[PDB]
Swiss-Prot record, chains B, C, F, G:
Cross-referenced Gene3D superfamilies: Met repressor-like
One GO BP: regulation of DNA-templated transcription
Subunit structure: Forms a homodimer, which binds to a toxin homodimer, which then oligomerizes further to a hetero-octamer. When bound to toxin VapC2 the toxin activity is inhibited; 1 antitoxin may suffice to inhibit toxin.
Entry GO MF terms: toxin sequestering activity
Record field: transmembrane: none
Its biological purpose: Antitoxin component of a type II toxin-antitoxin (TA) system. Upon expression in M.smegmatis neutralizes the effect of cognate toxin VapC2. The C-terminal helix of the antitoxin may obstruct the toxin's RNA-binding groove, blocking access to the active sites. Additionally, the C-terminal arginine of the antitoxin may remove Mg(2+) ions from the toxin active sites.
Protein known as: Antitoxin VapB2
Organism: Mycobacterium tuberculosis (strain ATCC 25618 / H37Rv)
Keywords for this protein: Toxin-antitoxin system
Higher taxonomy: Bacteria, Bacillati, Actinomycetota, Actinomycetes, Mycobacteriales
SUPFAM superfamilies: Ribbon-helix-helix (SSF47598)
From Swiss-Prot, chains D, H:
Co-factor remark: Binds 1 Mg(2+) ion per monomer; in the crystal structure only 1 toxin is bound to Mg(2+).
Family: Belongs to the PINc/VapC protein family.
The keyword Heme belongs to this UniProt entry's keyword annotation: no
Organism the protein comes from: Mycobacterium tuberculosis (strain ATCC 25618 / H37Rv)
Residues reported to bind Mg(2+): D98, D116, D118
UniProt name for this protein: Ribonuclease VapC2
Keyword entries, A-Z: Hydrolase, Magnesium, Metal-binding, Nuclease, Toxin-antitoxin system
Annotated PINc domain residues: 6-128
Length: 138, 72, 72, 136, 138, 72, 72, 136
């Protein structure tokens, strides 16, 4: 299909525990799942040391994900969305990375792939496409 | 180096212009970034073991306190 | 028409050349096809329902009186 | 072909009722039908609330129409055309938006698409190309 | 002083009946009172015939007013303000010219000079500077 | 014709850039428009009689119905 | 530094030349002064009260905990 | 002089308390103190409501600070610096915003103005110029 995704940290760390793990492995292989520069910095922060980070960036899955860098219009959009959510009573959230990932996806025509309810709060204003990664039933 | 791409159909050029405009980039800056993106994406088999290796390395992405620290 | 892209890094060009050869294509044929495919993926669909929805939402554009007010 | 159009409000709200609906939908998809900033403000004025306006701008067909903005040459041309109409006793026919859309089309190389005889009055002064939308 | 004004149609037609008429004549002479291309079209619409319009544009006061033409960012700002006012319950107003004059003044650093309460509705959102022309007391 | 303006102080250039950015114009498009604006403004005495003449010619600006018609 | 403005119409230049002569200035000296005067008129004033107001409005920027949340 | 600064949140909120307040106010007026898009998002996060955020962006000092936006080279440099810190056991000191502000300054020719020792840790790797705001 024509659909392409932008993967948030919340889905990246939960892929291996989804019933749809193998489907997502195949979509990443086909180049359909993009990642932001901001999410790459979050991956580096989470890694225990620099060599572990370097390894992840040179190996699948991360090496197979097209990288989406910011533009001035995306940065300004994130700020506009933040301010509009503040008009509707949001306080101390959604997070800065959530706003930047959502604005990147909105202006690039990508579906945000996530496990974070704050993307619903953003989509209530923007109407953008989102997809929640399936979880293993308890 | 400079690359000249000849005979781009009008409708393709119109799509490139709409995308560039939506992002606040010039036509040529958009094309340069898109070509870098393609060139830099690996063509590689992605396995279940690769996804499990990644989860062990980035488990802290699922720690909300660690992620709040990352953004202060 | 023709589009000149300046200052593409040599490492980007070398990767694109290798990608293109694997597909049986020259560099410039690969770039042309890549941009055309991008445009097809981006293309919007306009349906009869979209046009009806718009008419309903802005029926007032067909009201000379409201359009009166709009221009002071 | 090299032909491009600039759609007036009068055609925008009547597309759903044109026998040429399918052909116009295909041209919009391809970026051949542009819209002005002034016409977008008319769409917003008519919308019942802010939610509905935001939706209209992000969904087709408006999301697929490139925006043509004003320039000093266009604003001055609109005023020149208005004064020619006023010499003939006809300048309270065409509105300010009609003048601004017509001058944008004239100077930016587009055919005005409309259902408003005021564009015929303007074209009789300027010689520019206009097209009336067929509608039922 | 450093202050400059953008004159709306509502003040232009009422200058001669203000107690501050002479002060405003002097400020127009000094080049401190600008006018938009949109307001010039409103002047032409109001004129009874084309020769009367041509006369006004070649004579003071209009010939002494620097002309402010639109830019794409001004047009987009007018639309943003319209949409934000719609979120706050405005319906079928402020007018299109009021939004365009206010956005021009906002992004150009000019004070809107007016006799129209809808500029208060816009300034409740934008915080921009406005000045109401003084009227003759009844 | 082209005009080269030499030795513009940094702080003046910074103000020009901030203004252009706020309007969505390039530095040079802004300067061109500003120079036209200045050149086209008359230096002329403005009298009470001039303001009264104007009011008689544009009285319809104070007719709300006529102004609503102008904007349909 | 130097700024080149291309394609200024001859009628704009002729008016600027006449304006400048009346002031005892060359064309380029007049343009330099006009742009400097514009920059002075545009300049913002930053007061002690402005800085206090900002601190009060965003006191949370000095709260590591809130800045924690902000970065997930 | 050719020196320009990029102001971090840590200095922004402490200017009111600097003995050099007057000199910094004058530099801001002149456009010599720039700010990032990320720092603007931090200002917005902290504001109590949307009204207050809009006011802060349109009033001095923020209205007088030119905005420095990210580029691919800057985002990649931030990640490179983060990995060097992580080799030394120090990458959970500097935050993602600290890395992005430092790399923006490094590649865009600005001095970081701050009150945050994490910028000293980054500068010990990059060799870039930083300045600590004096404050009481
Ligand atoms: Mg009409
Ligand atoms: Mg820190």
């Amino acid at each position: 299909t024509d659909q392409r995704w932008l993967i948030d940290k919340s889905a990246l760390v939960r892929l291996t525990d989804s019933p749809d793990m193998e489907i997502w492995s195949n979509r990443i292989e086909r180049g359909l799942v993009h990642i932001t520069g901001v999410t790459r910095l979050e991956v580096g922060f989470s890694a225990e040391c620099g060599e572990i980070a370097r390894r992840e960036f040179r190996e699948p899955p991360l090496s197979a994900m097209p990288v989406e860098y910011l533009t001035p219009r995306i940065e300004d959009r994130a700020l506009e969305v933040q301010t509009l959510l503040a008009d509707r009573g949001h306080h101390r959230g959604p997070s800065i990375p959530d706003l930047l990932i959502a604005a990147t996806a909105e202006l690039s025509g990508l579906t945000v792939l996530h496990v974070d309810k704050d993307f619903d709060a953003i989509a209530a204003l923007t109407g953008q496409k989102t997809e929640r990664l399936t979880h293993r039933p308890p | 180096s400079d690359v000249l791409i000849r005979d781009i159909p009008d409708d393709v050029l119109a799509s490139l212009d709409a995308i560039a405009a939506r992002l606040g980039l010039s036509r040529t800056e958009y094309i340069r970034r898109r070509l870098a993106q393609d060139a830099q994406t690996a063509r590689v088999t992605v396995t279940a073991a690769d996804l499990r290796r990644l989860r062990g390395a980035v488990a802290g992405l699922g720690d909300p306190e660690l992620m709040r620290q990352a953004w202060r």
